Amino acid sequence: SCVKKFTVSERRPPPEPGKCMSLLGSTLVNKQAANKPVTILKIFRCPVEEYLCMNATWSGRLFVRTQDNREIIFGNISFTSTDSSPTTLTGISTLKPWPLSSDLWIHSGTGDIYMFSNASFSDPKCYITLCVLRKNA
Amino acid sequence: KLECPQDWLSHRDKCFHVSQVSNTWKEGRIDCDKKGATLLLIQDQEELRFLLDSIEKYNSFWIGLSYTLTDMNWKWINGTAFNSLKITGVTENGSCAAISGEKVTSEGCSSDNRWICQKELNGT
Numbered sequence A: 001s002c003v004k005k006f007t008v009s010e011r012r013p014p015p016e017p018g019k020c021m022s023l024l025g026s027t028l029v030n031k032q033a034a035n036k037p038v039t040i041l042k043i044f045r046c047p048v049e050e051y052l053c054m055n056a057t058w059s060g061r062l063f064v065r066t067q068d069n070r071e072i073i074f075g076n077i078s079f080t081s082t083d084s085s086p087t088t089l090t091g092i093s094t095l096k097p098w099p100l101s102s103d104l105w106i107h108s109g110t111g112d113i114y115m116f117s118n119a120s121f122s123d124p125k126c127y128i129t130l131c132v133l134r135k136n137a
Numbered sequence B: 001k002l003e004c005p006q007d008w009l010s011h012r013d014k015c016f017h018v019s020q021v022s023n024t025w026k027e028g029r030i031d032c033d034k035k036g037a038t039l040l041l042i043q044d045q046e047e048l049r050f051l052l053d054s055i056e057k058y059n060s061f062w063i064g065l066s067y068t069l070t071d072m073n074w075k076w077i078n079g080t081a082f083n084s085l086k087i088t089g090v091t092e093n094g095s096c097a098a099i100s101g102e103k104v105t106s107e108g109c110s111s112d113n114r115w116i117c118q119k120e121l122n123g124t
């Protein structure tokens, strides 16, 4: 089962088959707990729709901003959507050697970015490109 | 000279509140309204640089500027259309604006960021 939804964008429609769309941002998955001095674990998610319920590909670039306004792209990520199944992570690539501290890492299971609030850089963000596929692509 | 609220920054004809809490642009807008304020309306580069020098500055902060679907144009929450301050971005990647470091960037409205509220003078 898959119920078509599009909440990762509030002012733009999803692309038509077979067009693409650029998405920039990140969700704070554990928002309710995190918005309540101590260093805490924040979990971030790319702007990726779990119930897109259409054959599509997601291709994103993950980055942070340093204390000297420099953007560090620490990794690449990919997801696929199907008309019959929810969105699944299909791959992660990390910049080697790791350009950041141990205070941020990407989870392998999901593509979730785990960060400690004591980090000497900004919250992670994803430059995602959503490409919806034509019928029988 | 108007008395500015407790733990609020003061600069020219404005009072500023920087949130420590992250949320969507709409939730950020609601929060400023509950405080009897509005999201940040940047007057000039001098106002911008004041905030940068007194803000943790590497993170993104929602401002009172978005791509309104009724007008089909970038507009400040005060109803004034946006002109060239420049919004940076190679592509159209969102309908909501935020101060990113020193630059003004477009981002997805459903994203989670901190925000700057403002209380401005409008007479006696």
Ligand SMILES: *[C@@H]1O[C@H](CO)[C@@H](O[C@@H]2O[C@H](CO)[C@@H](O)[C@H](O)[C@H]2NC(C)=O)[C@H](O)[C@H]1NC(C)=O
Binding pocket: A055, A082, A083, A134, A135, A136, A137
């Ligand atoms: C979306 O992609 C799926 C593949 O994941 C397509 O399903 C295939 O459909 C053909 C018939 O058209 C079957 O012969 C295959 O067995 C199906 N593949 C799988 C793996 O289930 C589906 O047709 C695509 N949907 C659209 C609208 O094009």
Ligand SMILES: *[C@@H]1O[C@H](CO)[C@@H](O[C@@H]2O[C@H](CO)[C@@H](O)[C@H](O)[C@H]2NC(C)=O)[C@H](O)[C@H]1NC(C)=O
Binding pocket: B041, B042, B043, B044, B076, B078, B079, B080, B082, B083, B085
């Ligand atoms: C709505 O907000 C905008 C942005 O803060 C105001 O625009 C400024 O207007 C002054 C003149 O009053 C100009 O000198 C500035 O350069 C403008 N700044 C920008 C960035 O546009 C505008 O005044 C406000 N409109 C109303 C009706 O109050």
Ligand SMILES: *[C@@H]1O[C@H](CO[C@@H]2O[C@@H](C)[C@@H](O)[C@@H](O)[C@@H]2O)[C@@H](O)[C@H](O)[C@H]1NC(C)=O
Binding pocket: A039, A040, A041, A103, A116, A118, A119
């Ligand atoms: C940043 O924090 C790292 C781990 O944080 C830990 O988790 C929180 C929730 C608390 O339980 C805290 O006591 C833990 O330390 C540290 O390993 C690391 O040294 C810290 N980094 C800096 C730069 O201070």
